[model samples]
Target: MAMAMRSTFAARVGAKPAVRGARPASRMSCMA
Candidate 1:
């Protein structure tokens, strides 16, 4: 159960960057 929870949490955390990647403001901040 703990392993499954960890995997789920990991997947969500990993997806955060991809979601953020879609934002134009985020890209602008990165270039600054």
Candidate 2:
């Protein structure tokens, strides 16, 4: 499942890993 953030990450809502092409480890994904 792809969880999303309400903090407007990378200038986009519901995006994860903080920004472009970072490719964070995916046990879970979110931002705030």
Candidate 3:
């Protein structure tokens, strides 16, 4: 599913401290 793909990609990218910190907010918005 698309959500699964996003989750996986998010996980990979979220490993970065900055990404993890800004995630579920900045990342989602930027990704959009």
Candidate 4:
């Protein structure tokens, strides 16, 4: 249940190119 929302949020944040070429890493940084 929560897992689904995590990925959805991941995609939303990853969609932004503000963090450079690798936005996936920001998931932990932001989540932290």
| TM-score on alpha carbons, each prediction | 0.39, 0.15, 0.39, 0.39
Over 1-32, each residue of candidate 4 has an lDDT whose tens digit, in order, gives 57656755675676563355344654433221
Q: For each candidate, what is the lDDT?
A: 0.44, 0.41, 0.51, 0.50
Minimum summed lDDT over a 10-residue window in model 4 is located at 23-32
- Residue-level lDDT tens digits of model 3 in 1-32: 57756655665665552366555454442222
Question: Candidate 1: which pairs clash?
Answer: none
State the weakest 10-residue window (summed lDDT) of model 2: 1-10
Candidate 1, residue 17: how far the Cα is off, in Å: 11
Clashes per candidate, residues 3 or more apart or on different chains: 0, 0, 0, 0
Best by lDDT: 3
- For candidate 2, the TM-score is 0.15
Tens-digit lDDT track of model 1 for 1-32: 46655544554666553355535534212211
RMSD of 2: 6.6
Instruction: Return the clash pairs for model 2, or none.
Output: none
Local error of candidate 2 at residue 10 (angstroms): 20
Tens-place lDDT per residue, model 2, 1-32, is 22444333533543444445245543244353
lDDT of 3 at 13: 67
Report the lDDT of model 2 for residue 14.
33
C-alpha positional error of residue 11 in candidate 2 after TM-score superposition, expressed in Å = 22
